[PDB]
Design a protein around this ligand. Sequence first.
Ligand SMILES: Nc1nc2c(ncn2[C@@H]2O[C@@H]3COP(=O)(O)O[C@H]4[C@@H](O)[C@H](n5cnc6c(=O)[nH]c(N)nc65)O[C@@H]4COP(=O)(O)O[C@H]3[C@H]2O)c(=O)[nH]1
Ligand SMILES: [Mg+2]
Lengths: 254, 93
Amino acid sequence: RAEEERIERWVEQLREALVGDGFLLHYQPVLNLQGEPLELYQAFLRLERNGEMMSPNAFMAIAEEHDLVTEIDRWVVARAIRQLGERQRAGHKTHLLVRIGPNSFSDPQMIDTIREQLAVYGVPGERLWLQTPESKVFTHLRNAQQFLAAVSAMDCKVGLEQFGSGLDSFQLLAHFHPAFLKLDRGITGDIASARDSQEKIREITSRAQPAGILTMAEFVADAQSMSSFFSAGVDYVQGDFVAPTGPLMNYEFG
Amino acid sequence: GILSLALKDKPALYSAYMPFVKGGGIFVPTPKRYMLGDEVFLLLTLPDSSERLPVAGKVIWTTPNRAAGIGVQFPDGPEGEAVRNKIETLLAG
Ligand SMILES: Nc1nc2c(ncn2[C@@H]2O[C@@H]3COP(=O)(O)O[C@H]4[C@@H](O)[C@H](n5cnc6c(=O)[nH]c(N)nc65)O[C@@H]4COP(=O)(O)O[C@H]3[C@H]2O)c(=O)[nH]1
Ligand SMILES: [Mg+2]
């Protein structure tokens, strides 16, 4: 019970970040292997307390204990679009990939927020990509379909992260058409040096290309990975090999 | 390269240990500068013990409050749950 006061220290820090400065965003380039170069970044949430930066792995555990995740994902999406706005004012047609949660499927405020903010900042919905894992999309399906339809009704792109994984995934694909897929690290980490993996992947891409579904690889670290992903037709790649994560959009794609 | 952290008593443990982190964490001072989600290797000596526990963890806090280091998140495998339980045991003593 001594620590219970420290928990609330943290929670008050969080809500004050929700309503004021504290939260910020960092940006990692996503690169088009195949060669339709698009200014594409994935957005990562961060929290700053007097120069102390911290990762959502520190604080999301608490935040969930207070049904606060929905307001946070709203912040992410909203500041992401403001950044798309500043980015359009600079004369750049930049896109932003944005992690959202499955509770935000049920969030009417989220559908509002998306709409409102694209309007004010004059941002075409195809600049926004929202991704959510195949796991939680499975758990929460009826709501996920409602959300995908409402949001893709704004020319937004909706996708699955941590794709691959199990054999229930191509089952979900029948019932869910996303703009893109993010392959689970377990599949793509070793593709350099397996036969399980590249078998699985070329299977996934061969099925994925004609549906109009974009395939993307995460956590690229070496060059043999990239040649495998390329020969294999993966559409997008991001990782420390490609380009590291920062707070400024400054990558020269092409 | 190689990080190390030696906690001599349960107070130094409690000051390092980050219990609210998703799956436990530990604050490791280092002069060197890391970016969040960088993947570190750390050699963690617990107090009331001589075994060095090997932690392959992730950065989830950069401080450049107190101390000048990094928060290292324990892997979610059994190998990391192990060290988390060792520490949680030590602190309620
Ligand atoms: N996705 C990805 N990450 C890469 C890659 N290369 C390096 N990383 C780094 O490794 C961490 C991976 O994030 P995660 O494990 O998926 O787990 C993430 C994720 O669960 C969560 N998170 C990050 N950004 C957001 C966000 O905008 N919204 C929400 N709801 N959660 C977020 O925080 C965790 C920690 O992320 P970070 O501390 O920023 O640290 C990130 C990131 O900086 C890559 O190719 N792809
Ligand atoms: Mg600002």
